[PDB]
Design an enzyme around this catalytic site. Structure first.
Site, PDB file in Angstrom:
ATOM      1  N   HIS D 113      -4.324  -1.614  -3.196  1.00 17.28           N
ATOM      2  CA  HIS D 113      -3.330  -2.123  -2.261  1.00 17.28           C
ATOM      3  C   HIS D 113      -3.627  -3.609  -2.041  1.00 17.28           C
ATOM      4  O   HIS D 113      -4.775  -4.048  -2.140  1.00 17.28           O
ATOM      5  CB  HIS D 113      -3.362  -1.357  -0.936  1.00 17.28           C
ATOM      6  CG  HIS D 113      -2.781   0.021  -1.021  1.00 17.28           C
ATOM      7  ND1 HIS D 113      -1.500   0.265  -1.470  1.00 17.28           N
ATOM      8  CD2 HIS D 113      -3.303   1.231  -0.704  1.00 17.28           C
ATOM      9  CE1 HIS D 113      -1.262   1.563  -1.436  1.00 17.28           C
ATOM     10  NE2 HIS D 113      -2.339   2.172  -0.973  1.00 17.28           N
ATOM     11  N   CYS D 161       0.040  -5.425  -4.514  1.00 18.53           N
ATOM     12  CA  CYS D 161       1.107  -6.118  -3.800  1.00 18.53           C
ATOM     13  C   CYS D 161       0.593  -7.471  -3.317  1.00 18.53           C
ATOM     14  O   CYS D 161      -0.609  -7.654  -3.115  1.00 18.53           O
ATOM     15  CB  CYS D 161       1.615  -5.287  -2.614  1.00 18.53           C
ATOM     16  SG  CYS D 161       2.650  -3.927  -3.131  1.00 18.53           S
TER      17      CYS D 161
END
Lengths: 173, 88, 88, 173
Positions: D113, D161
């Site tokens: 992430h 991301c």
């Protein structure tokens, strides 16, 4: 001859150009017809500052880059001694120029004192920073803020320090 | 009809040094990066795409002297080769 | 004798999307960037340098769907072409 | 055949290799003798987190990247589910590996992430961030902190991301 519009830039012959279109098929940016295209470039150079040393020799840089970009087919706007705020305003104005719609590309050139954070405006001091971030430059020229340059190469050149370090290490020879 | 486009694409940035580090300017000859960039553009625009020209500029800085710097290409989203085709 | 070397040189970073933006991962097929990178490396390591392969990966993402992303090459100080010469 | 050490990676023939050394003269990174070289690669993948959703499919990514890097001649260390602190420790250990001295290059792959600031460690939450910055990765592998990789390509791959935005704008078709 350097008397032509391309000056000291070596020309791409038709033989070179067709070979380039053979080595790489559909992976080259298209260029617009020379007769109708309206290529723009922007040079922002800060030489004279309120608090930090004058950038002696900056005029040599402006002359060289202006003539080079003209040689490459670009109509060049030169802006001098701007605050970060003024730079932002100028970049927004540049993004709004109608000529980009009939252009195939752009060059933006920034020349100033700099720090790790970014590029110094004319008013910059350690006490009151006047900084334009590279991130802001990209944002102002992207597809949202500059739709006229969608799918067209946008080349950003930055002459500035990025910190205080000499950028070297020693090794045993 | 409306269609989606990438918000950020077809950019290349070329900085005069690596993060944290200085870039040099000669008081009469101008900025070393700028001069070197012009020389390489003049020589190579005819044969090399811009990414390749920037690589060559970096190579020219490779052996550091008392005034060292290493130009860096940043935030690259060119999806194609950018040839200037000078003269066309 | 001692000699100076650039502190930062011969790097290339390749990120799955542009700054501010998401990257996609399929729960069974894996991350789209990773899968695409592997496919391009397998196909092109033999003929193209790493910078060129990364460009091709970016090109493959060019037409955005409902799950869009644009991989970005960052902080590049490669002074030469990096060919993997697979099999050698 | 995919039964070989290079698996599904297409091979560069001797004919291809010598042509590559002709198209570009002294502008290719040298490769070390296959018989004696000790190429290393590192994969850090965070799949299971304290506060944020599990990264289902991450095992597919690990398998694919591990096998690819082996195909390309790299001995691959795989580390899973690390805090930013643990990642830093692992990167420092990687930089200190004696094999780099007899290697010609390295690959580092990070999969997690992420947010605008950087890559999430296993413990990351909005209240207590656990972030590894890209800047730290470069610093740990540079000539000061990793002299064994001086003059050798260091390829950093990051799946994460970089913010919350879908990354798109609309235009009239």
């Amino acid at each position: 001859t350097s008397s032509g519009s391309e000056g000291n830039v070596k020309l791409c012959s038709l033989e070179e150009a067709q070979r380039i279109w053979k080595q790489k098929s559909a992976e080259i940016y298209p260029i617009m017809d020379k007769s109708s295209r309206t290529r723009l470039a922007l040079i922002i150079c800060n030489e004279e500052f309120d608090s930090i040393p004058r950038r002696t020799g900056a005029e040599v840089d402006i002359t060289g880059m202006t003539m080079l970009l003209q040689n490459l087919g670009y109509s060049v706007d030169v802006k001098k001694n701007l605050t970060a705020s003024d730079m932002t305003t100028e970049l927004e104005a540049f993004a709004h120029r109608p000529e980009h719609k009939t252009s195939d590309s752009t060059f933006l050139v920034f020349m100033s004192h700099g720090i790790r954070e970014g590029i110094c405006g004319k008013k910059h001091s350690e006490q009151v920073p006047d900084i334009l971030q590279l991130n802001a430059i990209f944002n102002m020229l992207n597809t949202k803020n500059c739709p006229s340059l969608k799918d067209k190469p946008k080349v950003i050149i930055i002459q500035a320090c990025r910190g205080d370090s000499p950028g070297v290490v020693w090794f045993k020879d | 009809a409306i269609r989606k486009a990438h918000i950020e694409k077809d950019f290349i940035a070329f900085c005069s040094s690596t993060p944290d580090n200085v870039s040099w300017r000669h008081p009469t000859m101008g900025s070393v990066f700028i001069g070197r960039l012009i020389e390489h553009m003049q020589e190579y625009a005819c044969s090399c795409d811009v990414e390749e020209i920037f690589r060559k500029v970096r190579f020219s800085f490779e052996q550091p002297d008392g005034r060292a710097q290493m130009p860096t290409t940043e935030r690259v989203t060119l999806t194609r080769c950018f040839y200037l085709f000078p003269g066309h």
